[PDB]
């Protein structure tokens, strides 16, 4: 099974799913990483 | 310190003579190697056909020109020698002259070796090319003549360095 | 680089001149080429391997008997040298590179070398052993040519197996177990049971792509002719023969191809 | 410092109100949006807290090059 | 980048005027016992003077290392916490309490001493620790001292 | 006393440069003969890459000439700095020329074969070879700059 | 003192190693370009990018050498042994990094050019690989510049 | 007096060896990617992971070198031979670890690029192997950081 | 006075040699693992046992390096040559043992990948061989720790 | 004076040589047993003897090195250069003997794996060869112990 | 004086070289014997004679090492530089002779395993080569003992 993908969340979900899938309603780390990856990749390139 | 002092206290005349001899030796070795390289191809072509002996002889002459230049440089270096007086055996002029002689000899020998190797390879290729077709002999000979200029440039550099000898 | 002038230069020049001069008449030309090769006697091992190339087929032919005495009529020194039926096979196991391996691989003798198909299998195994031995002597640009030739032989054997020899137990496993990128990626031809499938398998190698083409010719023949004909067509690459490199094998192959062309000429 | 700490928290509440107004179309959709807003606010506030605690009472003073 | 107080590889005007001011030093060199005296901390970003100073490298390196350690601790804590939620959502067995709790507790406690030491040094201004003596305190496995 | 190193720099600069020049010219020449066996016209124009390789020797020769002229002992007191600088300047020029020629020889040898196959790609081979040959010019610039530091 | 005898040696070694790496890269790049263009002359122009990418290392090495040479001036200040040693270290580091980057770029570019005509996606893949390789050369140049700048104090 | 020479040499060696290891890894990964991507466009981007995984080691080495260079400050403290020895040891350890990690990562990445055309189920295993190998770079960086921290405490 | 110039070098050499041995083992282990996963993706995850065990050598080397670094305490006691030389020797021994163990583990894993691919029934034997190989690394680490413990003159 | 340098060097050399020999022997044994692990897994379990023998040789070398290290007590009795030289010689001898025995046992086991796979009747011969090989390691350990004991006789 | 710095080192090196030679010979002989036993299990037990004969080198080396170690005793009498140099020379000669004998015996046994496997008639006769090798080893040991007997000749 696959969790429903929104118009904007689809890209992040696809990027995260490159590690695999889960059960019909199991854990979906994409929900946290949709903002976590922007919340961490910013530091490595911080320059306004 | 003590080892450094001993190293700085080496006789410059020995180094100068070593360089002078090494120039001629390296020139002779390079010329012989180039001559052998050209001669293998020349003999192969002659076995195939003896028609191009005159064309092939140019490569041998060019290879021997390196030995001739080396011999001339060695004669010049021998002329550059002096009496090596005991008082000035460690004088700055004597040390400078010995270092210049060694540098000139090394440069001449290395340049002669490189030019001989290049000329030998070029002639070995050119003999086979001429055996394949005599029409290409002119371009191959021109390329060999152009490549032979390395020895002339090295000899010029050595001659320029030879003016630095000032042994009392 | 200086080793060429150190040794082998005269032999290389003689070989180059002989090749440049090259272009019962077929038999006479073959005899002349064989005499030229023999008169030429590091490079000794290369010459031995080149001779063993055809000597494997010569020994396979001599392994018969069954009108075995007729083998003396084709005693061409290029490939049918005397120096290169299990009792006689053990004696013939000497003085050949592939013979010691074939002694164990073809220990069944005529059982594994039946003249219908299994003799071709033994010949293919011997050719594979000889190709491996030749590839072992690495150090020159001829490794690519040897790999291409071995790949062509293996692919032709696989195509023949998939075409009709599959019924002769030449299955997908036998495409490499008995039928001699191929040394690493030959598994793609195990399922090429069709001409379209053969073209698709050839598509895995862009250089091999479009080589099969319609496959009406070349691939139409069995044994080792399918991809070997591709190598024959592409032999113009071998015609380059850059200098200061081992070109004795190239000259021998060119002479063999010229002899084959003269034979194919025949009565126009 | 502590005043700015409430400022970051207060900024999230207004953002929380906007998120609720926007995502009221979907209850489970709103629940997901609230998590994203809270995570973003927490991450930004933590980064600012690190940047402020580092320079609050420096152990080493800055020397300037010539 | 706004947090880092660096814009296009150049500082600019922070929300404050100047975080650190040269203690006296109307003509004295920056490298001095007085050095620079800070009136107050710039809230928007790092001190503008620190970026272009000679001491830019050590202070910035220490701050970046501490921030990286804290961020890694936070990410690991969030990942470990997600395990209980996943176990409850999938109604997993007692294995969560059996294994997820010690797994999320051991690493958390192990990094907790370092994180708390970093915070205290940042909070209490224990300059007797700095970037190095924190690791030095963490280095000793034995008791006493 | 120190001037021994300075004198050695000029000799090393020419020796190491010619060592790479001969290697580049040999590889370039061999390919030219191979192309000249069949393609008669292409070989004559292809000699430019060999001519390009031979230029590197001239660049090294000029660099050697400058070093020799600057080692006048009776003119100015050649301190250890002058000897060290001249030796360093020669070392860079000789080493760079050796590498630059080696690339030209490798590139030129393939270029002769490529031109003999498809004459269209002749322009592309020249462009790559010209770009590679710029390294010898780059080494020449460094040699002049280093040698210019003999003021004190 | 004897500090210039090491500082100038390091400055020369930087350029020497950078040129060696650039030549090692360019030889492989040219061989691959010729091999690719033998069969598909159209992609020859697109295959020349790695050659320039490798050649940029020569410019970087020349800049580092110029900086090192300008960093030594006995008439300005007494170049103590620390300054010469630091300059030599910077030169050696920059040269070795340039040589390694050149060798890697040459290998990668030769492989990509050999694979260039097989698929047009190589035109992007090899470019990305060359950029990732030149990143190391840029990092080495930055480190060398930092070391050369730090060499100026010498107490 | 001679200690700053040792320290600068250690920093330069760290940078150079890290650059060499990263270059070797990047060249191996580039050869593998050029071989793999001819058949399929998947290797163009989905398998470009080792290309940056190897440059991460070079970035770590550059960071360690910058830290070591900033460690030396004669105007602030007259460094004894202890500081030079510690800096040289830290630089050597960092550079050797970087070279080892670069070689291992290059070999593993070449193997993974070759296996990319095989069953894609092995991508997770290849990534895990690459991460386990790259852990050596982090270990070396930690060792270098510890050595640099202990370096300045000379009596 | 020159003791730290030996002790720090010994610690760095220990770390470097341990890392080199770990990388040498891990290269062969990863090559074999990739080959097996291409041949049989089912056991790819379970075949990372030598790959995982390779990092143990690096961890031990890092621990030994940390211990050696903590050994050099000039403020605590004037470091005589008798302590620096002992520390350097301990580091050299630990590094050489780690390199040897890494090479052995790499060879064992390269063999065992193919062995398990042909038949997974030899996984127990492969694990036993790997444990026997790692026993050498454990002995080397113990010897290095014991030698470093003798820094009291 | 400098005797502790010699003693520590000898102990380290002993440990290193013993570890290298054990590693070579274990690698050869594993290479041999790789085939037996598939050809006849039933006999593969009994095939682990050479690995155990190599581990035993390594353990003996480590024990000798530990004894040598424990023999160095500077605070109890001053270590003259004679004792240090004797200890270093003992360590070198033990390490060389262990390395040679390990290499021989590894080769023997590599041959014996195939020998027993072909015919189970060769297990007795393999065991005898392994015992004969281990006798050399035992003799080396005894010689090292004797030398270590004699190392303290100076005055 | 610094006598054990050479005497003890030579005593250790004697056993080291003897062990290395015996290990090489035993490894070759064991490989040959394993091959022969694979060919025929009947000859495996009878073909261990060269393997046992190769073991005399270890006994001779151990005896020489014990004698040399007992020959060094500063408490009994001070040993000059000559007293240690002679012992070192004797040890080196004994070790080199043992290594040469071990290599020769290994080669001879490797040939003889196949020789006996083919023709049982020549199996017993081939032992002459092993006897000659053992005689050479014994002569070397005698020469070493004669050299070592001069320990007390100094004054």
Q: Residue D45: enclosing H or E segment and its boundaries? A: helix D27-56
How far separated are the first and last CA of chain E, in Å rounded? Answer: 42
Instruction: Count how many Cα atoms sit within 13 Å of the Cα of residue H144 in the half-sphere of its side chain.
Output: 35
* Contact state of B37 with C2 under an 8 Å Cβ cutoff: yes
Separation between Cα atoms, residue F30 and residue B147, nearest integer Å: 12
Chain C positions touching chain F (beta carbons under 8 Å): 1, 240, 242-244
Which chains would you list as touching I if contact means 3+ CB atom pairs under 8 Å?
E, H, J
Rg (CA), chain A: 13
Q: How many residues does chain K have?
A: 155
Instruction: Count how many Cα atoms sit within 13 Å of the Cα of residue C54 in the half-sphere of its side chain.
Output: 17
* Contact state of B136 with F33 under an 8 Å Cβ cutoff: yes
- The 8 Å CB, 24+ separation contacts for E67-75 are E67/A43, E67/D47, E67/D50, E67/D51, E67/D54, E68/A43, E69/E114, E69/E115, E69/E118, E70/D46, E70/D50, E70/E115, E70/E118, E71/A40, E71/A43, E71/D46, E73/E111, E73/E115, E74/D46, E75/A36, E75/A40
Find chain H residues with C-beta within 8 A of E64's C-beta. Answer: none
Q: Does E59 touch chain H (CB under 8 A)?
A: no
Helix (H, G, I), strand (E, B) or coil at E21: strand
Q: Does C9 touch chain B (CB under 8 A)?
A: yes
Min distance E84 CA to chain D CA atoms (Å): 17
Separation between Cα atoms, residue J71 and residue J83, nearest integer Å: 10
Which among E29, E36, E122 is the nearest to D54, CB-wise? Answer: E122
Helix (H, G, I), strand (E, B) or coil at G69: helix
Q: Which chain E residue shows the shortest CA-CA distance from D50?
A: E67
Helix (H, G, I), strand (E, B) or coil at E36: strand
F and G make contact (3+ CB pairs below 8 Å): yes
Q: Residue E20: enclosing H or E segment and its boundaries? A: strand E20-22
Q: Which chain B residue shows the shortest CA-CA distance from C4?
A: B37
- DSSP H helix total and E strand total for chain B: 6, 0
Q: In angstroms, what CA-CA distances link C109 with C224, F88, I58?
A: 22, 73, 56
Which among C5, C12, C20 is the nearest to B36, CB-wise? Answer: C5
Task: Report whether C218 contacts C163 (CB < 8 A).
Answer: no
* Contact state of J62 with I153 under an 8 Å Cβ cutoff: no
State the DSSP string of C187-216.
GGGGG--SHHHHHHHHTTSTTTTTTSTT-S
**Residue of K53, K54, K48 whose CA lies nearest to K33:** K48
Task: Report whether G72 contacts F145 (CB < 8 A).
Answer: no
Among D30, D43, D44, pick the best mutation site for testing chain A contact (most A Cβ within 10 A): D43
Cβ burial, residue I79 (10 Å; 0-12/13-18/19+): buried
Min distance B160 CA to chain F CA atoms (Å): 7
Task: Report whether J7 contacts J68 (CB < 8 A).
Answer: yes
Task: Report whether H60 contacts G140 (CB < 8 A).
Answer: no
- Classify the C-alpha dihedral C180-C185-C190-C194 as positive or negative: negative
Separation between Cα atoms, residue D41 and residue H61, nearest integer Å: 34
Which chains would you list as touching H if contact means 3+ CB atom pairs under 8 Å?
E, G, I
In sequence order, the 6+-apart residues with CB closer than 8 A to the CB of H73 are: none
Separation between Cα atoms, residue F50 and residue F62, nearest integer Å: 19
Which among D32, D39, D47 is the nearest to A36, CB-wise? Answer: D39
Task: Report whether J18 contacts J65 (CB < 8 A).
Answer: yes
Token pair recorded at residue C62: 């001599």
Separation between Cα atoms, residue I58 and residue I47, nearest integer Å: 20
The strand pair at E36-38 and E20-22 is best described as: antiparallel
Task: Report whether E111 contacts E74 (CB < 8 A).
Answer: no
Q: Three-class SS string for F60-93? A: HHHHHHHHHHCCCCCCCCCCHHHHHHHHHHHHHH
Find chain C residues with C-beta within 8 A of B51's C-beta. Answer: none
Q: Does E57 touch chain H (CB under 8 A)?
A: yes
* Contact state of E8 with A48 under an 8 Å Cβ cutoff: yes
Task: Report whether F46 contacts F32 (CB < 8 A).
Answer: yes
**How many C-beta neighbours within 10 Å does residue G77 have?**
11
Q: Is E25 left (phi over 0), alpha (psi -120 to 50) or beta?
A: left
Task: Report whether K15 contacts J141 (CB < 8 A).
Answer: no
Find chain A residues with C-beta within 8 A of D35's C-beta. Answer: 31-32
Alpha-carbon dihedral of residues J127, J128, J131, J136, nearest 10 degrees?
A: -140
Separation between Cα atoms, residue D8 and residue C268, nearest integer Å: 97
- Classify the C-alpha dihedral H128-H130-H136-H140 as positive or negative: negative
Q: Does K46 touch chain J (CB under 8 A)?
A: no
Among C1, C3, C4, C5, pick the best mutation site for testing chain B contact (most B Cβ within 10 A): C5
Query: Hey, which residues does E20 pair with through a beta bridge?
Result: E38
**Residue of F15, H148, F2, F84 whose CA lies nearest to G88:** F84
Separation between Cα atoms, residue D24 and residue K2, nearest integer Å: 93
Find chain A residues with C-beta within 8 A of E85's C-beta. Answer: 27
Interface of E with A in 60-79 (CB under 8 A): 67-68, 71, 75, 78
* Contact state of C13 with B37 under an 8 Å Cβ cutoff: no
Give E99's DSSP letter. I
- Classify the C-alpha dihedral H105-H111-H114-H115 as positive or negative: negative
Which among H66, H70, H146 is the nearest to E135, CB-wise? Answer: H146
Separation between Cα atoms, residue K13 and residue J90, nearest integer Å: 9
A and J make contact (3+ CB pairs below 8 Å): no
**Residue of J64, J55, J49 whose CA lies nearest to J123:** J49
Cβ burial, residue K107 (10 Å; 0-12/13-18/19+): middle
In sequence order, the 6+-apart residues with CB closer than 8 A to the CB of I10 are: I68, I84, I87, I88, I89, I90, I91, I92
Min distance B87 CA to chain C CA atoms (Å): 49
Give D65's DSSP letter. P
Task: Report whether J95 contacts J17 (CB < 8 A).
Answer: yes
* Contact state of H149 with E135 under an 8 Å Cβ cutoff: yes
- Chains A, D: CB contacts within 8 A come to 15
State the DSSP string of C148-162.
HHHHHHHHHHHHHHH
Alpha-carbon dihedral of residues J73, J75, J80, J83, nearest 10 degrees?
A: -10
* Contact state of H70 with E132 under an 8 Å Cβ cutoff: no
Give E97's DSSP letter. I
Q: Which chain A residue shows the shortest CA-CA distance from D51?
A: A43
Min distance A47 CA to chain E CA atoms (Å): 4
Scan for tokens 């379209």, then name that residue: C196
Find chain A residues with C-beta within 8 A of D32's C-beta. Answer: 31
Task: Report whether H31 contacts G107 (CB < 8 A).
Answer: yes
Helix (H, G, I), strand (E, B) or coil at K54: coil
In sequence order, the 6+-apart residues with CB closer than 8 A to the CB of H141 are: H60, H63, H64, H94, H97
**How many C-beta neighbours within 10 Å does residue E95 have?**
9
**Residue of K152, K10, K22 whose CA lies nearest to K69:** K10
Instruction: List % helix, strand, coil for chain K (3-state, nearest 5).
Output: 85, 0, 15
Distance of CA J93 to the CA centre of its chain: 11
Separation between Cα atoms, residue K39 and residue C179, nearest integer Å: 31
Give A18's DSSP letter. T
Scan for tokens 């002639």, then name that residue: B123
In sequence order, the 6+-apart residues with CB closer than 8 A to the CB of H57 are: H18, H21, H22, H25, H98, H101, H102, H105, H134, H137
Token pair recorded at residue H2: 């001679």
Token pair recorded at residue C100: 């010691």
**Residue of G137, G120, G154, G151 whose CA lies nearest to G58:** G137
Task: Report whether I33 contacts I113 (CB < 8 A).
Answer: yes
Alpha-carbon dihedral of residues C250, C252, C257, C263, nearest 10 degrees?
A: 170
Query: Hey, which residues does E36 pair with through a beta bridge?
Result: E22
Token pair recorded at residue K84: 């240690």
Separation between Cα atoms, residue E10 and residue B112, nearest integer Å: 58
| Phi/psi of residue E38, nearest 5 degrees | -95, 125
Interface of G with H in 57-116 (CB under 8 A): 81-82, 85-86, 88-90, 92-93, 96-97, 100-101, 103-105, 107-108, 111-112, 114-115
Rg (CA), chain J: 19
* Contact state of E61 with H149 under an 8 Å Cβ cutoff: no
Max Cα-Cα span within chain I? 60
Rg (CA), chain C: 19
Token pair recorded at residue J70: 């424990």
Q: In angstroms, what CA-CA distances link G23 with F111, G54, G57, H75, J112?
A: 16, 8, 10, 41, 52
* Contact state of G111 with H22 under an 8 Å Cβ cutoff: no
* Contact state of A47 with E71 under an 8 Å Cβ cutoff: no
Q: Which chain G residue shows the shortest CA-CA distance from H13?
A: G93
Helix (H, G, I), strand (E, B) or coil at I87: helix
Separation between Cα atoms, residue G68 and residue C120, nearest integer Å: 72
Token pair recorded at residue E35: 């050095």
Q: In angstroms, what CA-CA distances link C207 with C230, C231, F55?
A: 11, 11, 39
In sequence order, the 6+-apart residues with CB closer than 8 A to the CB of H102 are: H18, H20, H21, H22, H23, H24, H25, H54, H57, H58
Tell me the technique behind this structure: cryo-EM
- What are the residue ranges of helices labelled H in chain I? 3-39, 49-71, 81-118, 123-148
Q: Which chain C residue shows the shortest CA-CA distance from F23?
A: C1
Q: How many residues does chain C have?
A: 268
Interface of I with H in 113-132 (CB under 8 A): none
Helix (H, G, I), strand (E, B) or coil at E38: strand
Query: Hey, which residues does E21 pair with through a beta bridge?
Result: E37
**How many C-beta neighbours within 10 Å does residue E75 have?**
14
How would you label I112-145 residue by residue, b for 16+ Cβ within 10 Å and e otherwise? bbbbbbbebebbebbebbbebbbbbbbbbbbbbb
State the DSSP string of E3-31.
TTT-SSSS----SSS-SEEESS-SSS-SS
Separation between Cα atoms, residue E99 and residue E94, nearest integer Å: 8
Which among I100, I126, I128 is the nearest to J20, CB-wise? Answer: I100
Scan for tokens 């060199």, then name that residue: E29
Separation between Cα atoms, residue K155 and residue K153, nearest integer Å: 7
Q: Is C218 left (phi over 0), alpha (psi -120 to 50) or beta?
A: left
Among D2, D38, D62, D63, pick the best mutation site for testing chain E contact (most E Cβ within 10 A): D62
Give the relative orientation of helices E56-89 and E101-124 as an angle to the nearest 10 degrees. Answer: 150
**How many C-beta neighbours within 10 Å does residue C181 have?**
14
Find chain I residues with C-beta within 8 A of E139's C-beta. Answer: 66, 70
Separation between Cα atoms, residue I74 and residue I2, nearest integer Å: 12
Token pair recorded at residue E113: 């001493």
Q: How many residues does chain F have?
A: 152
Find chain F residues with C-beta within 8 A of B95's C-beta. Answer: 1, 4
**Residue of D32, D11, D12, D14 whose CA lies nearest to D23:** D32
Which chains would you list as touching F if contact means 3+ CB atom pairs under 8 Å?
B, C, G
Task: Report whether K61 contacts K22 (CB < 8 A).
Answer: yes
């Amino acid at each position: 099974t696959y969790f429903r993908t929104n118009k904007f969340t689809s890209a992040f979900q696809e990027i995260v799913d490159a590690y695999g899938v889960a059960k019909y309603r199991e854990a979906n780390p994409g929900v946290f990483t949709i903002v976590t990856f922007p919340f961490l990749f910013a530091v490595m390139f911080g320059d306004w | 310190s003590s080892w450094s002092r001993a190293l700085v206290k080496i006789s410059p005349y020995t180094f100068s003579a070593i360089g002078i001899a090494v120039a001629i030796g390296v020139s002779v070795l390079g010329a012989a190697w180039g001559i052998y390289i050209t001669g293998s191809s020349l003999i192969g072509a002659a076995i195939k056909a003896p028609r191009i002996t005159s064309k092939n002889l140019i490569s041998v002459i060019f290879c021997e020109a390196v030995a001739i230049y080396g011999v001339i440089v060695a004669i010049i270096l021998q002329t550059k020698l002096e009496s090596v007086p005991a008082s000035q055996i460690y004088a700055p002029e004597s040390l400078r002259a010995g270092y210049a002689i060694f540098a000139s000899g090394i440069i001449v020998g290395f340049a002669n070796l490189v030019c001989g190797l290049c000329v030998g390879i070029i002639g070995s290729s050119c003999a086979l090319s001429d055996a394949q077709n005599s029409s290409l002999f002119v371009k191959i000979l021109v390329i060999e003549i152009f490549g032979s200029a390395l020895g002339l440039f090295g000899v010029i550099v050595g001659i320029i360095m030879s003016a630095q000898a000032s042994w009392p | 680089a200086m080793t060429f002038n150190i040794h082998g230069g005269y032999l290389e020049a003689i070989v180059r001149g002989y090749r440049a001069g090259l272009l019962t008449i077929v038999e006479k030309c073959t005899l002349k080429l064989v005499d030229e090769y023999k008169h030429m006697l590091p490079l000794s091992t290369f010459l031995e391997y080149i001779t063993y190339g055809h000597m494997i087929d010569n020994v396979v032919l001599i392994v018969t008997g069954r009108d075995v005495q007729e083998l003396l009529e084709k005693c061409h020194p290029l490939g049918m040298f005397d120096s290169i039926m299990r009792e006689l096979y053990r004696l013939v196991l000497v003085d050949t590179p592939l013979a010691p391996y074939f002694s164990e691989c073809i220990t069944s003798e005529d059982l594994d070398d039946m003249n219908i198909e299994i003799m071709r299998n033994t010949l293919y195994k011997a050719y594979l052993e000889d190709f491996y031995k030749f590839c072992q002597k690495l150090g020159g640009a001829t490794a690519e040519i040897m790999s291409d030739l071995l790949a062509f032989e293996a692919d032709r054997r696989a195509v023949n197996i998939t075409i009709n020899s599959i019924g002769t137990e030449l299955t997908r496993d036998d495409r490499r177990k008995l039928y001699s990128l191929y040394p690493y990626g030959h598994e793609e031809l195990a399922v090429c049971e069709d001409i379209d499938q053969v073209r698709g398998v050839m598509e895995k190698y862009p250089p091999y792509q479009s080589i099969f083409s319609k496959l009406s010719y070349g691939e139409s023949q069995m044994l080792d002719k399918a991809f070997y004909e591709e190598e024959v067509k592409r032999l113009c690459l071998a015609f380059e023969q850059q200098f200061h490199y081992g070109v004795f094998f190239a000259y021998m192959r060119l002479r063999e191809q010229e002899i084959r062309n003269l034979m194919w000429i025949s009565e126009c | 410092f502590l005043v700015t700490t409430l400022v970051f928290l207060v900024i999230g509440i207004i953002a929380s109100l906007c998120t609720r107004i926007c995502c009221n179309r979907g209850p489970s959709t709103n629940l997901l949006h609230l998590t994203l807003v809270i995570t973003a606010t927490v991450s930004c506030w933590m980064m600012w807290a690190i940047v402020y605690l580092a320079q609050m009472k420096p152990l080493i003073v800055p020397i300037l090059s010539e | 980048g706004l947090i880092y107080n660096e814009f296009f590889s150049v500082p600019f005007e922070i929300f404050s005027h100047s975080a650190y001011a040269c203690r006296d030093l109307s003509c004295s060199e920056a490298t001095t016992v007085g050095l620079i005296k800070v009136r107050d901390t710039y809230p928007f970003g790092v001190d503008p003077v620190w970026h272009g100073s000679r001491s830019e490298l050590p202070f910035l390196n220490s701050l970046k290392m501490k921030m990286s350690i804290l961020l890694g601790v936070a990410q690991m804590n969030l990942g470990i916490i997600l395990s209980y939620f996943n176990a409850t959502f999938f109604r997993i067995g007692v294995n969560i309490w059996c294994q997820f709790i010690p797994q999320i507790i051991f690493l958390n406690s192990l990094f907790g001493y370092l994180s708390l030491l970093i915070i205290l040094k940042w909070i209490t201004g224990s300059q007797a620790d700095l970037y190095h003596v924190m690791i030095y305190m963490f280095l000793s496995p034995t008791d006493e001292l | 006393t120190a001037p021994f190193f300075g004198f050695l720099g000029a000799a090393a600069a020419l020796v190491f440069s010619c060592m790479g020049a001969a290697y580049g010219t040999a590889k370039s020449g061999v390919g030219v003969a191979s192309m000249g066996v069949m393609r008669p016209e292409l070989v004559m124009k292809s000699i430019v890459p060999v001519v390009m390789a031979g230029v590197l020797g001239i660049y090294g020769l000029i660099i050697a000439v400058i070093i020799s002229t600057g080692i006048n002992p009776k003119a100015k007191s050649y301190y250890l700095f002058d000897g060290y600088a001249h030796l360093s300047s020669g070392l860079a020029c000789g080493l760079a020329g050796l590498s630059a020629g080696m690339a030209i020889g490798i590139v030129g040898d393939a270029g002769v074969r490529a031109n003999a196959q498809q004459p269209k790609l002749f322009v592309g081979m020249i462009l790559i070879l010209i770009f590679a040959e710029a390294l010898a010019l780059y080494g020449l610039i460094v040699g002049i700059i280093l040698s210019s530091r003999a003021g004190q």
